[PDB]
């Protein structure tokens with residue numbers, strides 16, 4: 001379900017990994033469609049954090065794993081479409097769509113996300129995704145801020 | 148300033164500094180936002196351009212981009228821009244930042260957490276997209292902006 005948005009950089013290189021950190025993050029993006037917190041957590045450092053910016057952050061591998069496990073109980077990531085990826089000293093940015101399905105309603109939405117990852121020695125010390133939560137809630141008829 | 152570092156920001160100070168010509172242009176642009184002046188800001192844009200605050204509709208072309216910025220500035224003021232992380236590759240610049248925004252109708256302020264992307268060619272902006280949660284911002288400054296600036300777009 002990976003349609004280009006109109007504004008995407010036309011060079012296909014803009015969406016491809018050209019550094020070891022970009023390569024790890026693209027592999028991580030590939031893994032997201034497993035909807036499997038236990039597989040995902042292997043990419044993370046000990047001193048780490050995760051935040052979907054409209055919701056509270058999680059600090060440390062255990063809390064990150066439990067947050068993801070809880071997300072996957074109410075929604076599934078059916079596809080991940082990465083348009084732009086860039087890296088520089090320890091940070092990787094991804095502009096993407098995650099096609100998300102709300103399990104209670106069966107409804108899907110193409111969630112526009114800009115995400116940032118911090119790495120050290122090939123492991124994720126931070127992951128933050130920025131998007132508009134209300135629009136997703138209304139598309140899939142489900143209030144997530146409560147949950 | 149009004150610039151507090153989040154807990155999670157990369158500790159090396161290099162992470163928030165420009166080290167490419169594209170990064171430097173984008174930081175100058177970020178410095179200009181506190182002008183609250185759409186006519187000044189439009190100078191940084193290419194002809195084939197676009198702007199989008201991602202919870203609202205995109206604007207295509209310089210006049211629409213200028214009108215969108217002008218519309219925002221009729222009702223809010225950017226009091227400060229705090230850039231934590233800046234990176235560029237491949238004609239793209241990314242900025243992780245907080246904009247301290249004050250809603251003019253209510254007088255209330257909010258530290259809006261933003262991740263934005265810029266596309267550039269020959270030193271001009273061909274695309275600018277800012278990602279953030281609009282509802283949190285509306286509820287903080289007691290202003291339904293989507294209701295207002297949604298129809299506007």
Ligand SMILES: CCCC[C@@H](O)C(N)=O
Pocket residue numbers: 052071077098100111129144
């Ligand atoms: C609350 C929406 C969460 C979205 C997130 O799981 C993703 N990266 O798609």
Ligand SMILES: CCCC[C@@H](O)C(N)=O
Pocket residue numbers: 200219225246248259277292
């Ligand atoms: C609708 C909120 C827009 C936020 C934006 O003006 C910004 N600070 O760049």
